[PDB]
Ligand binder design. Structure first.
Ligand SMILES: O=C(O)C[C@@H](Cc1ccccc1)[C@H](O)SCc1ccccc1
Ligand SMILES: [Zn+2]
Length: 171
């Protein structure tokens, strides 16, 4: 399991570089990212979150944890001004959730682990999650859309959760 960076770690603000070739090393990273993400458990993880500053996102929106998806060098284009409220969380802002409004339909262009390009249209949870994970690659967290008090309260509660997770390793 890869360690996940926690807000307010400044390495989460890093702007990810495009992946130049889908090597067997980015394939193993993807594999390690899925295990880390499934174990958390979470439905998405950006390579930025495990301190690997490259345009790689893993995701699995299924209950069964058996619909895995990879997005490498993604471009996300909204297809509407209409937004959709969603209560977002983030493995890098542990146990914090709040409402974010994002465009409700998007185009995703990305490459898969075979280096093949694809283009799909996303709504509902896929649209929410791809935009959340694209934000990570541009050094942005979902708490940047909240009021500063909400951000400060998130920061203070995450620092407490992280301290408790360290104490749990000593016990
Ligand atoms: O760590 C991340 O970046 C992934 C977030 C993605 C997310 C996007 C939109 C809304 C909520 C979360 C994690 O998946 S949050 C953990 C989680 C686990 C099970 C079900 C829902 C959320
Ligand atoms: Zn996140």
């Amino acid at each position: 399991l890869l360690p996940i960076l926690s807000f307010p770690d400044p390495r989460l603000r890093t702007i990810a570089k495009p992946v130049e070739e889908v090597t067997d090393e980015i394939r193993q990273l993807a594999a390690d990212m899925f295990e880390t993400m499934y174990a958390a458990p979470g439905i998405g993880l950006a390579a930025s979150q495990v301190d690997r500053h490259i345009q790689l996102i893993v995701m699995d929106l299924s209950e069964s944890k058996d619909e895995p998806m990879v997005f490498i060098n993604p471009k996300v284009t909204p297809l509407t001004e209409e937004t959709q409220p969603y209560e977002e969380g983030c493995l890098s802002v542990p146990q914090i959730y709040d409402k974010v409004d994002r465009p409700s339909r998007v185009k995703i262009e990305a490459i898969n682990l075979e280096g093949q390009a694809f283009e799909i249209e996303a709504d509902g949870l896929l649209a929410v999650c791809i935009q959340h994970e694209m934000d990570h690659l541009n050094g942005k967290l979902f708490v940047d859309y909240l009021s500063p008090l909400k951000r400060q309260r998130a920061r203070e509660k995450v620092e407490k959760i992280v301290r408790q997770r360290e104490r749990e390793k000593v016990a």
